[PDB]
Symmetry: D2
Subunit: 358 residues, 4 copies
Amino acid sequence: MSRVTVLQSQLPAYNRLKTPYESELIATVKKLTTPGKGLLAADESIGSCTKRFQPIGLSNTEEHRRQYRALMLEAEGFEQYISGVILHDETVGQKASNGQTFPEYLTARGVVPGIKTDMGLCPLLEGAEGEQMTEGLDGYVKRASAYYKKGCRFCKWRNVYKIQNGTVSESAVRFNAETLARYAILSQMSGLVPIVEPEVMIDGKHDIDTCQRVSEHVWREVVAALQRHGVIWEGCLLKPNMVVPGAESGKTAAPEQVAHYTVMTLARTMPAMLPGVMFLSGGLSEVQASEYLNAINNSPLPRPYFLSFSYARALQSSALKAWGGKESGLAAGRRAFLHRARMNSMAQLGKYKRSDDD
Amino acid sequence: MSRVTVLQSQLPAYNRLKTPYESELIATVKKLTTPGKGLLAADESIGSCTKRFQPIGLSNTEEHRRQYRALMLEAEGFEQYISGVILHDETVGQKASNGQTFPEYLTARGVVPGIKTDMGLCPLLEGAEGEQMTEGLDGYVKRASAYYKKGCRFCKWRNVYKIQNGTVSESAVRFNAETLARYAILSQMSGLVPIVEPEVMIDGKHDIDTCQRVSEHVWREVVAALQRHGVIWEGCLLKPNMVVPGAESGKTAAPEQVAHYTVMTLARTMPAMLPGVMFLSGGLSEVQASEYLNAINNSPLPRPYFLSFSYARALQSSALKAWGGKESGLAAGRRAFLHRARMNSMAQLGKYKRSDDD
Amino acid sequence: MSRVTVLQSQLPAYNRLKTPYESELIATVKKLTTPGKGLLAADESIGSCTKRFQPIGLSNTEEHRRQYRALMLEAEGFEQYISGVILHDETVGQKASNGQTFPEYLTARGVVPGIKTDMGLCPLLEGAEGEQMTEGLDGYVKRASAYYKKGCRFCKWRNVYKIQNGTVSESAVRFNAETLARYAILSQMSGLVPIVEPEVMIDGKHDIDTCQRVSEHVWREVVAALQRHGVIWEGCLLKPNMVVPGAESGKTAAPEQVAHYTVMTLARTMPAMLPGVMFLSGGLSEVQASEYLNAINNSPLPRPYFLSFSYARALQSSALKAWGGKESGLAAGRRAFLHRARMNSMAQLGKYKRSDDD
Amino acid sequence: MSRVTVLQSQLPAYNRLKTPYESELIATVKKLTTPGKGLLAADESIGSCTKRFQPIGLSNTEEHRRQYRALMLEAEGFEQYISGVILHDETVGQKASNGQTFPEYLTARGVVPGIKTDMGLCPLLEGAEGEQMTEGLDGYVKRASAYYKKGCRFCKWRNVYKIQNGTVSESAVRFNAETLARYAILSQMSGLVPIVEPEVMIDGKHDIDTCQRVSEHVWREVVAALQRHGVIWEGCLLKPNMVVPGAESGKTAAPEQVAHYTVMTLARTMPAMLPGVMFLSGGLSEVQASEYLNAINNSPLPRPYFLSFSYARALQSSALKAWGGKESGLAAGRRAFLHRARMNSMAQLGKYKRSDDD
């Protein structure tokens, strides 16, 4: 019969995140889920830029990295296909040729500036050898708030899961899901729409069925963690891997099959309220990235969420090659970029034509 | 580096239920999610008919209960609005006028026969006073297999949650969710599509927001348990309460508000793969049940699943009174039943018109 | 800001079971944890009696089963070594030679009457082939209440875990723990001290390290479930398997090794408040059961709980053979039973001498 | 059906932490659980010294803080009552009078040097207003490894829980438990014995029963998280609050009552393998800390673990006053310090006499 007066916030059923940024997060989500548009992931680390530049003989310097981002961001008309850009910490403070910082340059053109906020992969130290966790939660709100003041309105955090012997440890499944969930809450509290990226890596000899089982298992726990932390579903996005056979499996998957497996897996795990799913391109070729997204947007399976792209190499490869790191290559580089952006825009609408890439 | 060969079934990622009935379950779900059709819940207990028959001066006997069910089951043309019927254990063994058992009779008319398989509510004995659990898992497969052989292809199991002081105990949330999840698995293994009913009762003075918060909390855990038990999402259905203010709150929500709160809550908790949601009427009037379902099917919020009805009193109330328990009242009783069935059929399609109703 | 008045019982931190039987449960635990005494498990099913009787040519009839129990229960002097007897449902209503029901007979002679309340093993239908769940929770309180009125003051429920390929499925680990936890709560509410038996079976070719890992994993989850259900720790007992190599492993284990592994595993999982641990004999010989218990009670490792026995075959094997199901064998049969009871009483005290068993 | 070869480390039952430092961690625990000895907590922050040094009129400077620690660290014969010292980051790099860094100095005197490794409290941003999380996991191994190279062999990390309205949010209970569990694993992997401190703060008007309920709830989840992360129980220690009434409750508990509640709560949550419990004394007077620890070590309740102290103010308070921050006060200050140390040494042995104090 003993009754006690407590705070509503101390009751399990009243744990939904409370933030004054809710309306803005929703508004940002709306912009990021615009039909025919997707995201450009230009958040490559300095180390990743080394790999990008090696093939074209461009030294990896701050000025060259600025020019690398400018190649894409200053491509006239890209906003027709790109709704948001995931920037690297360094780039947020750099400037376009006109004096505008990149976030200002994007915002001026209706493109939402985003920021990769995780601090990289580290050994998990639990589970199986080779598994990794992601650092970055300490001091997160301080960093996120600084990015917000600079114009960023969304962010991205990547956790990886490595399929070994057809499985992944429960230690990794649980720990990385909790990391992603905490990241999502801290982001929303800071005014940034969080793009949750639980990437089941393509590396390995596993077949598509194994990727499907592991992906469903991994993503289901990510959702469970988000529910426990009280995420605002209306204000977040997912950036998952498509379900495909392992890179060293030696097997192939028709776009129709990839679409079936991918859409089926998302539907079995994701709440219907999830606003959007922006696929990572991972180890996919530029063409596969477009073909798969197109098939996904032609799937008869349940898919209430906006299904689009958040590609890095799949949107940059040809452009970098055509550019060659030379001013005289800007025009060719930009034509290549806009072409890939257009193809993926069409794929988002389910109207991509393979003959356009011939 | 120690390696070990195990059964795939012993790995967490490979826990999806394996049943030879999978294809048939999916086929049954397809029938139960037919546009413009809903379910008739005729699984009232033998004891409950004593008070139900009181107003019409009908003695509660087996033969009279048979006639009560025949009033609706033998109403020619009801199959245009009803895709399946949840039968009571007793009725499964009773016969229609033509000699066939009701399950055989229904099947011949394209209506799927179902059976309520739970064994009633009992004190939870954990959590708060007044909370209840549902019994029935012991010997379940044996019972379900027998119903299957008699023609049943789907079942229903009800758990209830009582809102007291604006909340429910975690003991009830966890335990009832686990019961529902185990029930779903045993049903699918037995060849019966399970209708999972986690009813947050309308009883109380709570407002609509409290119902929203508790319903979201309760349903989220039901989904979590279903995921842990490895349910075949493609072969199950949900029978939830609509999100409305308490029966003693002194408030009555407008159709659009009920639709908003209900669809939002389902979307934040249910996987997009869930094939259907057949609402219970609880303590709603016959007209409210139609008005609310219509508004729900006009909601702009995400809703990949089939949204329909699984009504008991909301379909039988007027019919029972017109019937009066007399054979001469069958014509009037059936006209009333078919009217309500038609109103809800149109509500499923989102074309319900209040003016066409009394 | 928002404050709400709720029932203390609706708060997670106040979930400890509330029962007017608490003081009596604790008093019963005290009797069952008396130095030099252990439990006699005489709850063999009718089917198990067939296996027990076959070797001595005794037909499996109700009267012969009564005589089988009388052989032990009326063996004057066994009370010095046995604090409680786990009876089978049938025996609870049978009478001793003096006209008293067995529970009345035992109580009058200083022994606590107990009862096996589970309803047997059934296929788990989740996880790996061969795994099993235990039925019996439906209608439990009604059954337990009836046994209490008959004089029973404690009960026993057995769940089993089968090591296959060096592991067990998470489905089994979670489900069976949940079953045991709910059983414990219902028993305490009914006035019966629950003996929780999570038996990791000896069956298989696994080694002792594997038994250790699986036992620790299984027991840890049982404890987790008991904590979630708010069990009264001072009013329950555990009946676990000892940690030993698989029966088909072909490997040997010295008593001191079994003691190290067993005590270490219990300490890593059991709360220090657990009042007692009464080991099952499983697939151990009569002498091994005594030798191992003796070593366990000479272990330098942490062990705040009373460590004793709850043996069936380990106390009955030789007695049954000497008895031969004949009146003329009662003397020899009882001599054998009392000898084994004495050896295990000595082992509980850590004073067992292998030389005493020739 | 299908079989698969996986890494043993990918199976749930084989999640125990694997570190080459196991033997050393266990050896360090043995030293820290020496009869008659406890820990000195000298990990106060640099900022706190400003107000701490205010009473004695000592300016807060690096040099003065060094003298403050040297007061007790260089006190002759304190190693008779102190087995280890929790150092502050700054102090690890400071030198004793003979030129040796304090870690080298303590190691030479047989005292184990430890280090507080957490990075402070921050808003939880989930749950109820006022609740806090603890940061520091990012880059933990790098920092811990550096401390290990300097001589540290154990560490401390503190999480707090605030009782408000007689309860705490599940958000705090779960998140802080996970933080403590991850901290423990990272510490063991780095070669430092982790001292897990889940402090239910004494602040508030709550009574002793409320502190009991919350402490049991909080600690049970900490244990649950530790089990999930696979901690080496043999190589970790607990630093919990004693179970007492709130500081503003207007009530003071008797030593015997605090002992009952505290020991009972530990027994109901802590596994029997936990090697030691080193109580914090926040909120208690120098005398109470001794009286309470003494009563605890005279409790008839189960307590297999070493029960001692890990006091800061309760050991330094009087010494600081007698020292006055002057060279002429060292002699007196050290007499007061060694006195309190001796008193608690006796309390650990349960031979404390209140007549020895005021």
